[PDB]
Structures are given as C-alpha cells and as structure tokens.
Amino acid sequence: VRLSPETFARAALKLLNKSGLEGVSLRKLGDELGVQGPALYAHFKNKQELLDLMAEIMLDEALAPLDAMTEVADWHWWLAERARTIRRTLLSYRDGALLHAGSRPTADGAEAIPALLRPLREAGFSDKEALTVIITIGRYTLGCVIDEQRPGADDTFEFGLQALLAGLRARL
Amino acid sequence: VRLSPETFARAALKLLNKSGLEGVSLRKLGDELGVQGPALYAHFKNKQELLDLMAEIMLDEALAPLDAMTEVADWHWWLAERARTIRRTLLSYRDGALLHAGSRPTADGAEAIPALLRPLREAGFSDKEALTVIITIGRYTLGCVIDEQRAPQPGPGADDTFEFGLQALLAGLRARL
Ligand SMILES: Cc1ccc2c(C)c3c(c(O)c2c1O)C(=O)[C@@]1(O)C(=O)C(C(N)=O)=C(O)[C@@H](N)[C@H]1C3
Ligand SMILES: Cc1ccc2c(C)c3c(c(O)c2c1O)C(=O)[C@@]1(O)C(=O)C(C(N)=O)=C(O)[C@@H](N)[C@H]1C3
Numbered sequence A: 001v002r003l004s005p006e007t008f009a010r011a012a013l014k015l016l017n018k019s020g021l022e023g024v025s026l027r028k029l030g031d032e033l034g035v036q037g038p039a040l041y042a043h044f045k046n047k048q049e050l051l052d053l054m055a056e057i058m059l060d061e062a063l064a065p066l067d068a069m070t071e072v073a074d075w076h077w078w079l080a081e082r083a084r085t086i087r088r089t090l091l092s093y094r095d096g097a098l099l100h101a102g103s104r105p106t107a108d109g110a111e112a113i114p115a116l117l118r119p120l121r122e123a124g125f126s127d128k129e130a131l132t133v134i135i136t137i138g139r140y141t142l143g144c145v146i147d148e149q150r151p152g153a154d155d156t157f158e159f160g161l162q163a164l165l166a167g168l169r170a171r172l
Numbered sequence B: 001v002r003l004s005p006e007t008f009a010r011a012a013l014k015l016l017n018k019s020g021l022e023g024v025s026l027r028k029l030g031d032e033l034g035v036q037g038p039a040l041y042a043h044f045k046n047k048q049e050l051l052d053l054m055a056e057i058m059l060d061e062a063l064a065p066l067d068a069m070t071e072v073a074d075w076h077w078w079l080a081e082r083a084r085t086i087r088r089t090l091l092s093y094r095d096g097a098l099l100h101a102g103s104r105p106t107a108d109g110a111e112a113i114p115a116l117l118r119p120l121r122e123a124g125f126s127d128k129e130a131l132t133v134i135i136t137i138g139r140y141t142l143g144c145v146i147d148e149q150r151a152p153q154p155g156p157g158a159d160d161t162f163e164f165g166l167q168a169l170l171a172g173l174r175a176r177l
C-alpha cells in the first residue's frame, strides 16, 4: 500500500472493529503491515498520533455532508445534526468513544477549522467562541456515548443537547 | 477486615489508583484481599457490580458537603458545584472517568436519589426532569474529563471549555422552568 498517514490510519480503523482499541498500536499495526510496518513510524511517533488521525477520519466520513454546506441559514439545526451524527458514528464503531477520547485535530484537520466555524461566525459567535462551541458540543456527545454503553438514552441525549443549544442561543 | 461490600470496593479503589482500571477485577481484588478474597463473591455477581459501587463511593466522598445542604435556594450554583466537584474528583483518580463510564446507581445509592433531586424539584423540575438533569450534567462532565486526559491545542483550554459548556447547559435548563 502507499506510504501515507491516511492509508495507515484507515487500515488501523479496520483493525479497531476487528480487535478493539486494545488491538490497536504502532507495533500491533506494523504487524498487520508486514515489510511495510517500519514505515508506520515515519508518520506516527506514538499511539496517540495514530489515534488522532483515526478519530478525525472516522467522524469526517460521517460529517462530510454537513461540512460541504455553504451559507448555512440555521446554525441551531446544523450544530444539532453534527452532534447527532457524531453520536451515531461513535456508537457504530467498536470502542468508538474510547478511541475518540483524548484525540485532538491533526495539522490537516486544524486547517479545516475556519471553514467549520463559519456557520457559527455568520450567526454572531466570535471566532474564539465558535471554536469553544464546537469543542463543547463534541464533549457533551462523547460523554453521553461513553456512558450510555452498559454491558431513554436517546431522550436524555436530546434533552441535554437542546438545553446546551438554548444556552448558546442566549449568548447571542 | 470486615466482610462488607463497601470495605471491598474501597480496597478496589486503592487498586485502581495503584494499577489503573486494568488492575481492577473480581479476581484481582480477591488477590489483594488474600485469604479473605473468596468473600467478595458473596457480594458482587460480576465486575460491573463492583465498578458501580466504586464509582458511587468515589464521588460520594467529594459530593458529601453538597449533599448535606438543605433548603438549597440557588440550584444553579449547587448544580454547577456538583459538576465542578465531579470533574475534580474524576481527574484525581487514575482512570477515574474510565472507571465511571457505564456505571449506574446501586440499590443503596438509588435510595438517595429523592434527596439528591430536592433542590431541583423545589426549583420547579418534575421528578423525571430532575433526574434527567442530574444524568445530563454528569454525562457532560464525564465527556469533558475523559477528553481532557491525553503541546499547544486550539481553543481556550480544559477549564474554560468545561465552564463554557456547563454555564450554557445550566442556562438552557433554567429556560424550561
Ligand atoms: C482541543 C480541540 C481543539 C479542536 C478540536 C476540533 C476542531 C474538533 C474536535 C475536537 O475534539 C477538538 C479539540 O478537543 C472534535 O472532537 C470534533 O469531532 C467535533 O467535536 C466536531 C463538532 N462538535 O461538530 C467536529 O465538527 C469535528 N470536525 C471535530 C472537531
Ligand atoms: C441512568 C442513571 C440514572 C441515574 C444516575 C444518577 C442518580 C447519578 C449518576 C448517574 O450516572 C446516573 C445514571 O447514569 C452519576 O454519574 C452521578 O455521579 C451524577 O451525575 C451526579 C450529579 N450530576 O450531580 C451525582 O450527584 C452523583 N450522585 C451521581 C448520580
């Protein structure tokens, strides 16, 4: 396979559904790559660098339709749909919320933040507040997903989502 | 030591801080208790029952001052302080948020929920809404703590980010009164 971060991270996402977060590491992934294993380290210094890219790709795949939208008229709806999409996506992956927890944007992901914030800026949120809104909504969703897992949940999720969104509206 | 679940679960919290959540299980707790280990199985049907009790004890210790408040007139302040206290507490234990994720009240902990909800009922929340408010605030705090644990990053940082969402969430809840 081509030696690129995304190709390796997408192979690791396959390994995640197969073996869980426990079965995902640089060594463990290099083992699933054969002669190409050692190339993994040129792009990821540690497990967390790999998990950051996996986490970003996992949610990019599901949020792409919302990311492509131009001149979003209703930031409330748009943010709510982001959260619902994140929740559905994390629930769809084995250890999805565990993989996401602690992740941060990659360099290429961070370059996409200005576009991500534009619907909120057009709504009246400052650039600084718009980013805090994004981080907060993702963390509320992450907390719901990781807790609702147990070896009503929908109602409780939207109850808190709508309250959060109403409180943000009061800030404008 | 005395053969009670609370003594067993508090020993398991020592194991959590020592070895992390991977070092916590019925078998490993039995090893820690030595000759008294087999007694734990009369009190916990499965690992999750142990984790449920640990998760309650962990936070009860820190929430006790807030739980003792009577005629709480400022439910906003009270709930905000509960969230801040949970956040501080979960961050103070090794794998604290991971231990907590997925836990549910025990029988004896559930008996305390009516008292937990009093400030919220007195503010005008129904019994169902008040419980949902508790769940929501704790899940928000859980998501923050679990995501905080990990160089310059975008945004204002964990404290300001946590408070931003807490205050927004509390304002939205106040809006349905
Ligand atoms: C310190 C720091 C800085 C920045 C972060 C950013 C930009 C995101 C995330 C972060 O966690 C961050 C973070 O922790 C997420 O997790 C997202 O998944 C998310 O929350 C949402 C959303 N709420 O719509 C998205 O649009 C996604 N694109 C992800 C953007
Ligand atoms: C499905 C269901 C039902 C009920 C739950 C309850 C009552 C709590 C918790 C739950 O998770 C629940 C849950 O999941 C917690 O986790 C708490 O730690 C919490 O959130 C707060 C708080 N917000 O003040 C507390 O005061 C604590 N005492 C814990 C009470």
Ligand SMILES: [Mg+2]
Residues within 6 Å of the ligand: A100, A103, A104, A138, B147
């Ligand atoms: Mg994130």
Ligand SMILES: [Mg+2]
Residues within 6 Å of the ligand: A147, B100, B103, B104, B138
């Ligand atoms: Mg809980």
